[PDB]
């Protein structure tokens, strides 16, 4: 089970590294929810739009 915890922390860390290379803006915990949701076959074009539209709503 300790090896399972190291597997996830290793891969979430790699995914955070790409996120900063593309300069996407997601922090670790929002990335955590995002991969956990997209992990169950979510149409990721639909999710991308939702995240863009709330980031623009929170501007006030």
């Amino acid at each position: 089970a300790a090896a399972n915890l190291n597997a996830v922390r290793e891969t979430m860390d790699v995914l955070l590294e790409i996120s900063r290379i593309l300069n996407t803006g997601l922090d670790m915990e929002t990335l955590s929810i995002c991969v956990r949701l997209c992990e169950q076959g979510i149409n990721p074009e639909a999710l991308s739009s939702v995240i863009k539209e709330l980031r623009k709503a929170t501007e006030a």
């Binding site: 995914l15 149409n43 990721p44 939702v50 709330l54």
Partner: protein, 102 residues
């Protein structure tokens, strides 16, 4: 919290920096659109997504990362993400921005 809908509440509540039940009016936004589409209509192939981020990355005066991305793209392939590699990473692209506004 494993079930899909539950997650969005948490996703929404942190993206929108407010209280748990207060954000529902906007929260309602996502319920309709995410529900609208679940079963993707575009087939599975990571290479296309990979080829896209290098090209995008290359025309922006940042070309070492055209292979730094490649090195990372295999690191994850080494570990287990259950064939959602195309779906995640793709997401991370469509939310992109060159650091300079240009």
């Amino acid at each position: 919290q494993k079930s899909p809908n539950v997650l969005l509440q948490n996703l929404c509540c942190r993206i929108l920096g407010r209280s748990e039940a207060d954000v529902a009016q906007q929260f309602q936004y996502a319920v309709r659109v995410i529900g609208s589409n679940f079963a993707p209509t575009v087939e599975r192939d990571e290479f296309l997504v990979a080829e896209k981020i290098k090209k995008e990355l290359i025309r922006q005066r940042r070309e070492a990362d055209a292979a730094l991305f490649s090195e990372l793209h295999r690191k994850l392939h080494s570990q287990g993400v259950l064939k959602n590699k195309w779906s995640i990473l793709y997401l991370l692209l469509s939310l992109s921005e060159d650091p300079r506004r240009q």
